[PDB]
Amino acid sequence: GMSFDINWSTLESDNRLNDLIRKHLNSYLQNTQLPSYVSNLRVLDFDLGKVGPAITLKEITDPLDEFYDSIREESPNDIQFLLEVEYKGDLLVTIGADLVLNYPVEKFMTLPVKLSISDIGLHSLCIVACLSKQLFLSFLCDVSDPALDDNQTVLDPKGPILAATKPLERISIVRSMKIETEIGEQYQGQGSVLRSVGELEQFLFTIFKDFLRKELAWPSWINLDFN
Amino acid sequence: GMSFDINWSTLESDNRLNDLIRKHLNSYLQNTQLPSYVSNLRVLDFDLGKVGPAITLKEITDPLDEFYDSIREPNDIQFLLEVEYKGDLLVTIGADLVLNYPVEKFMTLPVKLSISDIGLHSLCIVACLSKQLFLSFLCDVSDPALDDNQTVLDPKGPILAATKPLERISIVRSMKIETEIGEQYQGQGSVLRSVGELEQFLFTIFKDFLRKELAWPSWINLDF
Numbered sequence: 201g202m203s204f205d206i207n208w209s210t211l212e213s214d215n216r217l218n219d220l221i222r223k224h225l226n227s228y229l230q231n232t233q234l235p236s237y238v239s240n241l242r243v244l245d246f247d248l249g250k251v252g253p254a255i256t257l258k259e260i261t262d263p264l265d266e267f268y269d270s271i272r273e274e275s276p277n278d279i280q281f282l283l284e285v286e287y288k289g290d291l292l293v294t295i296g297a298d299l300v301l302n303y304p305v306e307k308f309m310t311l312p313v314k315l316s317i318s319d320i321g322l323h324s325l326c327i328v329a330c331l332s333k334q335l336f337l338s339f340l341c342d343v344s345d346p347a348l349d350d351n352q353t354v355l356d357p358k359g360p361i362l363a364a365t366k367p368l369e370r371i372s373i374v375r376s377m378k379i380e381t382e383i384g385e386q387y388q389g390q391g392s393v394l395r396s397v398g399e400l401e402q403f404l405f406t407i408f409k410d411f412l413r414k415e416l417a418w419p420s421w422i423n424l425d426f427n
Numbered sequence: 428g429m430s431f432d433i434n435w436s437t438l439e440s441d442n443r444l445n446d447l448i449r450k451h452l453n454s455y456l457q458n459t460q461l462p463s464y465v466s467n468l469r470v471l472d473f474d475l476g477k478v479g480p481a482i483t484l485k486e487i488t489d490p491l492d493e494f495y496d497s498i499r500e501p502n503d504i505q506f507l508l509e510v511e512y513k514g515d516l517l518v519t520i521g522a523d524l525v526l527n528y529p530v531e532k533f534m535t536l537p538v539k540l541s542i543s544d545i546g547l548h549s550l551c552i553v554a555c556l557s558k559q560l561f562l563s564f565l566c567d568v569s570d571p572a573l574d575d576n577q578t579v580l581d582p583k584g585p586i587l588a589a590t591k592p593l594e595r596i597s598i599v600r601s602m603k604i605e606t607e608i609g610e611q612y613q614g615q616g617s618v619l620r621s622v623g624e625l626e627q628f629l630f631t632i633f634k635d636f637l638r639k640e641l642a643w644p645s646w647i648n649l650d651f
């Protein structure tokens with residue numbers, strides 16, 4: 201329907217959203233076991249961009265009880281939005297990698313390389329919950345997930361999506377994603393190198409999707425405490 | 428910074444937003460006393476459009492006391508926003524004009540006024556309480572009473588106190604009004620001048636409407 205341009209600049213003098221995502225993602229990367237073909241991984245830059253999602257409000261409800269339960273461990277006024285979120289924005293992750301060539305010997309050579317994750321496609325149901333007053337945000341499931349056939353609510357806790365008993369049968373929240381790599385002109389001929397680059401691209405793809413899934417995808421969520 | 432596209436389609440599937448605003452404004456018009464030269468005023472159509480404001484969050488605070496008090500007459504929350512609008516809002520208003528042709532003749536001229544191209548750049552506040560929400564435009568961004576550096580959320584500062592209503596600039600910076608006349612008529616000058624008068628009147632009326640519905644100390648209130 202209506203378009204908006206939002207600017208949260210003053211809310212970010214000391215901490216910048218981009219930088220927060222970058223350090224978090226970096227932490228995640230440096231805590232992952234790396235294959236033999238890559239020596240180091242590092243986020244060179246993260247950029248949420250200037251193009252955001254198309255947001256459709258689907259329903260308005262009480263927050264899920266699982267949130268309350270979470271708080272119990274470690275109010276009518278509270279509220280929860282169910283949102284259809286469609287993203288084809290300009291998010292861009294630039295990652296630096298040291299590709300390791302082992303073709304002769306072990307660790308024969310290292311090529312500085314850098315990869316670009318971009319063009320992320322998404323179309324999924326999320327929820328945003330206000331509770332007392334920590335803020336919860338979580339991507340529930342893709343719009344066309346089979347567990348929605350028959351047109352009965354996602355907010356059913358005994359239903360498949362929310363119960364999260366079969367993560368394997370869920371269709372991926374990230375619909376598409378583009379990865380490029382640029383390497384030295386000198387290496388564009390060698391097939392061994394190109395194959396290694398391919399493997400690294402795939403690995404990075406899976407790693408990024410994993411990160412997203414355990415940071416934002418239900419039953420995981422983003423918790424903001426404001427005291 | 429970042430762009431969004433918002434769609435509130437299903438929250439109101441009985442009643443529509445544009446329709447609600449249309450009969451609200453219609454009520455306003457029908458309880459306005461009209462000049463002698465116009466017999467009927469009516470909102471033909473209202474359209475908030477698809478182009479919204481550029482929004483900058485300035486501050487975040489607990490809601491004003493006037494709201495809490497407004498409840499009877501947490502953690503509840505209030506946003507202070509810089510709002511810059513150059514959107515595609517469009518009001519189309521129908522009017523029956525009264526024309527004086529010579530030989531002391533009276534005639535009626537149906538006319539269609541279009542209010543569009545509204546320019547705005549102003550500090551507004553959006554307060555969520557219990558949970559009813561409050562929408563109110565405080566003042567224009569370049570109001571003198573904001574001179575140098577001072578806060579707008581100061582309750583006995585000028586803007587919030589509502590001390591001196593005529594001293595402040597109007598929230599609406601710009602506005603465009605056109606008129607559709609079937610020209611059997613547009614050629615005469617009598618008709619064009621009558622239409623001019625009507626346009627000015629409508630300008631005043633609309634500005635007045637928004638300052639009594641949207642401008643602090645008045646606000647828009649939602650009930651759920």
Ligand SMILES: CCCCCCCC/C=C/CCCCCCCC(=O)OC[C@H](COP(=O)(O)OCCN)OC(=O)CCCCCCC/C=C/CCCCCCCC
Nearest residue numbers: 202447448451475479480510512516553562640647648649
């Ligand atoms: C959803 C807002 C997005 C678009 C906002 C555009 C901003 C620029 C628009 C220029 C001025 C705003 C145009 C609106 C004219 C006034 C309309 C109006 O008064 O409608 C009120 C009338 C009241 O009806 P009742 O059911 O009787 O409720 C109690 C009545 N007191 O109709 C309504 O209730 C609908 C209210 C919808 C208001 C929509 C306009 C609000 C302005 C948007 C705020 C701008 C930025 C803030 C973001 C808004 C986030 C909620």
Ligand SMILES: CCCCCCCC/C=C\CCCCCCCC(=O)OC[C@H](COP(=O)(O)OCCN)OC(=O)CCCCCCC/C=C/CCCCCCCC
Nearest residue numbers: 220221224248252253285287291328415416421422423424
């Ligand atoms: C404003 C969102 C616009 C962009 C949305 C398009 C979706 C793009 C696809 C994914 C983009 C988001 C990737 C970054 C997510 C991971 C970053 C991260 O974890 O940093 C959070 C880090 C703190 O994390 P913890 O509180 O410790 O939680 C630990 C894990 N449970 O810093 C923060 O404060 C997180 C900030 C959260 C903002 C995330 C926004 C992305 C979510 C998009 C939802 C779209 C709906 C819009 C509603 C937003 C209302 C604020």
